[PDB]
Amino acid sequence: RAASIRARVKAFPKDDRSKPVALTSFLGYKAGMTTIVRDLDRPGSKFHKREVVEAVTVVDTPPVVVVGVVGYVETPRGLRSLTTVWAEHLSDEVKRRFYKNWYKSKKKAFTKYSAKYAQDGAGIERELARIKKYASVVRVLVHTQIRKTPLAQKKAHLAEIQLNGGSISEKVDWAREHFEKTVAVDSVFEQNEMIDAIAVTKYHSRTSINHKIYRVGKGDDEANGATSFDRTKKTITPMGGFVHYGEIKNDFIMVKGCIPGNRKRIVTLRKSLYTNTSRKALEEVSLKWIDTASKFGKGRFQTPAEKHAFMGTLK
Amino acid sequence: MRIYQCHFCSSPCYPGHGIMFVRNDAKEFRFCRSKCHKAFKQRRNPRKLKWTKAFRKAAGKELNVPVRYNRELVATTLKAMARIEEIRQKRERAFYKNRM
Amino acid sequence: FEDILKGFPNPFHRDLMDTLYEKNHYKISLAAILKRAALGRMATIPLAYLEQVRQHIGRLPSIDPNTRTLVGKSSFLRCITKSDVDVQPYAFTTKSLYVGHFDYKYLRFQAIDTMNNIEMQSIYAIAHLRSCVLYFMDLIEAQVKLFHSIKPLFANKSVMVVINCQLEENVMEVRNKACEKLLASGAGVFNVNLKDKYLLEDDEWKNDIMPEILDGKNVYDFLDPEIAAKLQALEEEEEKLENEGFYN
Amino acid sequence: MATRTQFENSNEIGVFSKLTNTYCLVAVGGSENFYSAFEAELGDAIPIVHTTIAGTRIIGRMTAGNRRGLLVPTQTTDQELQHLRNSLPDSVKIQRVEERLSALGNVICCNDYVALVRETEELISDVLGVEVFVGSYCSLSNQGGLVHPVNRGSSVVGAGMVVNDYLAVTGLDTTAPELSVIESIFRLQ
RNA sequence: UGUACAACGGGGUAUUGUAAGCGCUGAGAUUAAGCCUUUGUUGUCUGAUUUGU
RNA sequence: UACCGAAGCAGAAGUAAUGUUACCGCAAUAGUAAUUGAACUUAGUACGAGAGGAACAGUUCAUUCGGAUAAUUGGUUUUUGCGGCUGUCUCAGGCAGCCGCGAAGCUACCAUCCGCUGGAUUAUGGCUGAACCCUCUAAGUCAGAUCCAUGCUAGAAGCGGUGAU
Numbered sequence A: 001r002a003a004s005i006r007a008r009v010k011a012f013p014k015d016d017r018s019k020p021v022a023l024t025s026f027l028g029y030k031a032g033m034t035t036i037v038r039d040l041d042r043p044g045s046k047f048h049k050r051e052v053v054e055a056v057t058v059v060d061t062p063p064v065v066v067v068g069v070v071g072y073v074e075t076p077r078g079l080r081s082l083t084t085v086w087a088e089h090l091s092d093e094v095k096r097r098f099y100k101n102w103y104k105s106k107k108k109a110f111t112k113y114s115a116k117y118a119q120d121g122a123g124i125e126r127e128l129a130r131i132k133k134y135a136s137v138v139r140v141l142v143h144t145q146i147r148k149t150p151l152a153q154k155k156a157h158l159a160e161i162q163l164n165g166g167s168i169s170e171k172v173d174w175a176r177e178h179f180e181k182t183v184a185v186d187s188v189f190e191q192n193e194m195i196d197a198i199a200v201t202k203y204h205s206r207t208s209i210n211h212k213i214y215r216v217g218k219g220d221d222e223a224n225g226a227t228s229f230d231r232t233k234k235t236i237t238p239m240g241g242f243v244h245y246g247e248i249k250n251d252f253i254m255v256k257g258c259i260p261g262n263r264k265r266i267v268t269l270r271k272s273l274y275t276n277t278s279r280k281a282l283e284e285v286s287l288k289w290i291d292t293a294s295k296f297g298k299g300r301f302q303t304p305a306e307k308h309a310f311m312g313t314l315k
Numbered sequence B: 001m002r003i004y005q006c007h008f009c010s011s012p013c014y015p016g017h018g019i020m021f022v023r024n025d026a027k028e029f030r031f032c033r034s035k036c037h038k039a040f041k042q043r044r045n046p047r048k049l050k051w052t053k054a055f056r057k058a059a060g061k062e063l064n065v066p067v068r069y070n071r072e073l074v075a076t077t078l079k080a081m082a083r084i085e086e087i088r089q090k091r092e093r094a095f096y097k098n099r100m
Numbered sequence C: 001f002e003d004i005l006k007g008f009p010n011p012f013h014r015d016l017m018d019t020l021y022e023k024n025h026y027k028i029s030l031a032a033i034l035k036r037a038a039l040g041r042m043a044t045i046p047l048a049y050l051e052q053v054r055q056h057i058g059r060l061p062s063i064d065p066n067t068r069t070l071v072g073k074s075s076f077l078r079c080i081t082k083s084d085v086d087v088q089p090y091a092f093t094t095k096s097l098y099v100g101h102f103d104y105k106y107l108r109f110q111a112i113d114t115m116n117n118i119e120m121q122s123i124y125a126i127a128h129l130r131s132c133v134l135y136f137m138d139l140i141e142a143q144v145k146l147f148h149s150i151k152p153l154f155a156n157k158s159v160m161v162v163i164n165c166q167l168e169e170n171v172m173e174v175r176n177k178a179c180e181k182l183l184a185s186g187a188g189v190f191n192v193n194l195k196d197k198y199l200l201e202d203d204e205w206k207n208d209i210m211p212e213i214l215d216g217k218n219v220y221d222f223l224d225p226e227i228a229a230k231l232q233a234l235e236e237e238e239e240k241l242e243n244e245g246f247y248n
Numbered sequence D: 001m002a003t004r005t006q007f008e009n010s011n012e013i014g015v016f017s018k019l020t021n022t023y024c025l026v027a028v029g030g031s032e033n034f035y036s037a038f039e040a041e042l043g044d045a046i047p048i049v050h051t052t053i054a055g056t057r058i059i060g061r062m063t064a065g066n067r068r069g070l071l072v073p074t075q076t077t078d079q080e081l082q083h084l085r086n087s088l089p090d091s092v093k094i095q096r097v098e099e100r101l102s103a104l105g106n107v108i109c110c111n112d113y114v115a116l117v118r119e120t121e122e123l124i125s126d127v128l129g130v131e132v133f134v135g136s137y138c139s140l141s142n143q144g145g146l147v148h149p150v151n152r153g154s155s156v157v158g159a160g161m162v163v164n165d166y167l168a169v170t171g172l173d174t175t176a177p178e179l180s181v182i183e184s185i186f187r188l189q
Numbered sequence E: 001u002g003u004a005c006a007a008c009g010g011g012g013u014a015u016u017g018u019a020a021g022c023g024c025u026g027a028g029a030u031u032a033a034g035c036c037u038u039u040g041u042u043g044u045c046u047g048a049u050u051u052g053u
Numbered sequence F: 001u002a003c004c005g006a007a008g009c010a011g012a013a014g015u016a017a018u019g020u021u022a023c024c025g026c027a028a029u030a031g032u033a034a035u036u037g038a039a040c041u042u043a044g045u046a047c048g049a050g051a052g053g054a055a056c057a058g059u060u061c062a063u064u065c066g067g068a069u070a071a072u073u074g075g076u077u078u079u080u081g082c083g084g085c086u087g088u089c090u091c092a093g094g095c096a097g098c099c100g101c102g103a104a105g106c107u108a109c110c111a112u113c114c115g116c117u118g119g120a121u122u123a124u125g126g127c128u129g130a131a132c133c134c135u136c137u138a139a140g141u142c143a144g145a146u147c148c149a150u151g152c153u154a155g156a157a158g159c160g161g162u163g164a165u
């Protein structure tokens, strides 16, 4: 059985001294599956340029904000958490994660620590300098903005993301500046990038690697579910919403295959832990058409705009 | 892709949907869901069944070469599609109002 | 054990194996085919000769006696085609069965060249095969007439005599004569790029996309040519539908 | 004049190739020598279009036409038809034909002056602008035609080889007598 | 003690082929028993009880 | 089945409860694997009198098995759903009945997505160099698969940091 509803990242990719400080993983909530068709541009294949049809999963990825940073000392008995530091503020759902009886409890969340941050910062700057001189491996503390995702969970899942940049002084400087900021989904992953998926099945946790992101969903603009070919004013959400899921109104990610876990389950993504040299990873996934028919039942129409076309008109 | 019209009900057949078994007799089998496919298999007469456009259009319930695809040619289609859709919708609404 | 005999063959070959090898020895070798006493008897119960002949035939030329076949006098086989023959002038250098393949008039032809065992082998290869017998020499009476004196016993081979032959034209003429007389007697690693490989009215839209779907329907149905007139007609029809009273 | 090539070790080259006096059709593949041989002899005089029919590897059976125009089978995808139209010059027409069997070349053979197979016959005559009277066992061009009595005696003349007014192609299995027969019937010499 | 929770209201979303009755009528009907949302209405918010440098 | 050596081996083709609670974490440790075959280019080229036809490298697939999925196809249905129909009498086609269609579901090789990369070594290929000129071996030393690492699953009814009085 899994330890909790959320899964734990057991490894991180090798650090890069030259690259800038950036996040290594992202997490979201499963949003079912959808059908897609694309041109198979793979060279040396008997189906070159053919319209290959396959299923792609959809995961809701609300914005994730940084809430703290943690450094770890390379001790002879493994990595030890040198010091954890939160940034001046904890969200309502962030505080809720620390209570089993939040409604009954007095909601006495960070009070002296918040008051401590109101001081001249010397203590916080002292800890930052400590981390700068001391342990040179740093992990960021973040949470999911479940307040935006339309789920009854209403509880933010805390998670740690390791920075892959060099000059850990730059790491702490970035943390010092990007504290309590919101990180968009597109800032961690991009289209055609190969990622791995980890989640909990319908109850064991398992990891699957070599999964390509078919599309990165910017949920702020319309027609996010329409490709360059279809380019219709349609969202990935079909008519009536989703099966056992509320709605998509924020950033989302589309991944080849089916991530483990039923709908509404939280999942995490990572950049394959290494630089895959396969030509499949390198090739770009041009998109032709994305299915938006009502999954609930058997939808004979894509959107209500064209639904009346078959019937012409209705009472 | 090629969105066919379901011959049983003159309904769209979007990519990835429907069933078309390639029989040796070489016939088109266009359908939108299992309902129409089974109705065709059952030989339910579309020309005399109320819920299919084939019968409704006549009963009074409702009303070879390629193109080079130049920028100017497609530019005309943008307005033509909207005009045709509006005309068809208005005609259908008028027909329904007359039927009422 | 029996697998060895299966791969060993058993009319020219019968005498060919009797000069390049020993026929009687070969036949004898082929036909000579709690438990301590039995094991010793089996162990107690010339085999290298079979392996030697197998190795020799493994690279020897394969020819059918019924197929068409035909100083520097020995350089004819080397010059006629891509065949190698020892340049040593002494006669006995031709122990091996040298063969050279070539095509004449879309038909396969080949030349063959070859008492001591070598002499018997050559005699058998001449008599048993359908190949013609030829006498080539560069420009003494007794030496020259030796072949003619022995001609009668193998005259059935349609003998031909040509004498000067290092010049290539002579070799070509000899081959042409003999051939007629015989019958008379990188890879795909990236997607294929089609850009600039197709024609268009202009290159402005060479990088075409062709979405093929608009407003939920295929563009191919609406992609009529220069239908601005049709759009104007549709606008006129809409005006006539609105102002005539259909939707007053 | 004549050419010899192997389509990924295949002996029948006409199945995956089609030649005319104004355009050429060849199935997509990863063999650089196969396309290089066609390009070197034909140069850039005519467009050597990398294309497929209905996604199938074979194109000779499906495609039949002349220099005036090209006829595509019903099952051809619209994208393939658009790509062919773009690749073919404006002087060459393209027309779709409704046929039960997608293999147009199995029963239809034609050249710049004559054709063979009445709705389809008249359509071919109009599109190709030629008179119309065995496609798999026939080959026709302006240099005459060849029919069954190539590729070591293969009886399918219309599949093993393809030829136009100035270029002939045959499989590697073709023998010298077959090459001579092809040259004589098409009066290359 | 407030766009928080639950039940109602509308809408969209699936099964259907035109229930009974007098063209209504791809209407109505199961309508979620393994669908969703939202624009209106109503009620909700207090005990048992254990631990702590 | 992989790697080497002999072999007229031209080409084709021996080794193996813890100050409570809650959150975020480390990992000594236990388990661990992908599997079998196919097609394309160099490929009609090295080889060879000809039948015959490579390879280091780069690509595309298929069978079995492992982790998941139901976007949708099927096995399928207490949505006993919509419509129809026969006993039951005063339109309900009632209900312990049948039929055409049927979402939702468990589920399939009956479908879909994925299924490892760095080092030390046996044999082996070699350098320097004595016993005793030589020699891969005596002292040193490069390459190289069984082993160890990477990743994956769980976490000692072991450990670090953080909030609340």
Ligand SMILES: [Zn+2]
Binding pocket: B006, B007, B008, B009, B010, B011, B030, B031, B032, B033, B036
């Ligand atoms: Zn239909």
